Amino acid sequence: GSKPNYALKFTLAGHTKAVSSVKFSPNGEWLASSSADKLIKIWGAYDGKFEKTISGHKLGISDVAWSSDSNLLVSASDDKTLKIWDVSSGKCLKTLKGHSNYVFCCNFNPQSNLIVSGSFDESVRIWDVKTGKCLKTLPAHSDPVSAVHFNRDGSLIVSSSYDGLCRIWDTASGQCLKTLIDDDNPPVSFVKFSPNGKYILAATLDNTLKLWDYSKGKCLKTYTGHKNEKYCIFANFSVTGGKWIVSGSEDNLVYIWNLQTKEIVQKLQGHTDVVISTACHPTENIIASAALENDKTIKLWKSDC
Ligand SMILES: CCOC(=O)CCc1nc(CO)c[nH]1
Fold first, then answer.
1. Which positions bear N6-acetyllysine?
2. Taking the CA of residue 260 as centre, how many other CA atoms within 13 Å lie in the half-sphere pointing to its CB?
3. Cα separation of 29 and 26, whole Å?
4. Distance CA 150, CA 157 (A)
5. Nearest atom of ligand 1 to the alpha carbon of 36
6. In 3D, which of 232, 183, 237, 229 has the Cα closest to residue 211?
7. Nearest-angstrom CA–CA distance, 22 and 239
8. 225-237: buried (b, 16+ CB within 10 Å) or exposed (e) per residue?
9. Is the CB of 278 under 6 A from ligand 1?
């Protein structure tokens, strides 16, 4: 149909502090959750079935991300490290050391030979997955780095910061290609490339999501009606059915907009705290949502459209 009809299917309990992020495995099999409780949990994507806990970080985790082949995870922790995990064995393969403050955000490149990280230390780091060596340190920002993401061919990195900037980096050289957002304020709390790599979705802490044309460097769409003044809340392109934008919200709801029209097409109610993270299943019309410490649950929602 023209609108989605996401309905609650499962509630996933077990984290003992705020959930920080949820991500679907590229192969659709799994949901991974990270939490302030220092743990990663793996869940069945379709039935919410608890699979395993992955442990090792000495402090809370802000983010977790999947390799392209669904075999590895990378986590970003307040212990100033990232850890690369074998999902099958649950073992830590590498500890990525070099950040001087909390590591907030992380992603594999499509090749999954590199990891990008952003930290409270105001740097972006590019790591070799095989060796766990830091290849490049980018002096990217003048305040904590809120998000990092590679584009579809891995040639570009997009970063965002509380400094109010969105910057695009050449992966090979680490050199800045452009400053896409150049305001003193507000803080840019989230950024990611569109599936096709032509657009950047950016959240600012003035209750606003914006879709930017990367090449032209101008704003194509604005999404409002949600609450976002404090937290680095993820946002998604939903592509399996209708073409939506999905975001959590500080009013404890998930918001879904029509990408083209910018109209809100659904609000998902159930969480009892800030929805910090949403993920869209790679093949099925399924949303995962995760909430802060008054809730500490993950919800799986499914839609016919
Ligand atoms: C327990 C509190 O979790 C958080 O506030 C972390 C949320 C978070 N947002 C991004 C966006 O790149 C990474 N991590």
1. 83
2. 5
3. 8
4. 4
5. 1
6. 237
7. 18
8. ebbbeebbbbbbb
9. no
Handedness of CA 66, 35, 211, 177 (dihedral sign): negative
Beta carbon of 107 within 6 Å of any ligand 1 atom: no
Q: What is the resolution of this structure in A?
A: 1.8
Atom of ligand 1 nearest to the CA of 189: 11
- Supply φ then ψ for residue 41, to 5 degrees: -120, 145
Length in residues, the chain: 305
**DSSP for 116-170, written as a single string:** EEEETTS-EEEEETTT--EEEEE---SS-EEEEEE-TTSSEEEEEETTSEEEEEE
* CB 275 near ligand 1, within 6 Å: no
Structure tokens at 55: 């442990």
- Check if the beta carbon of residue 293 is closer than 8 Å to that of residue 19: no
- Strands lying side by side in the sheet with 275-280: 7-12, 298-302, 286-291, 275-280
Question: What domains are defined for the chain?
Answer: 1-305 (2.130.10.10)
C-alpha 83/C-alpha 95 separation (Å) is 5
CA of 262 to the centre of ligand 1 (A): 25
* Sign of the dihedral through C-alpha 173, 177, 183, 188: negative
Beta carbons of 83 and 95 less than 8 angstroms apart = yes
> In the chain, what is the greatest distance between 2 CA atoms, to the nearest angstrom?
49
CB 120 within 8 Å of CB 137: no
Residue 36 CB coordination number (10 Å): 19
- Output the CA angle 57-60-64, nearest 5 degrees: 75
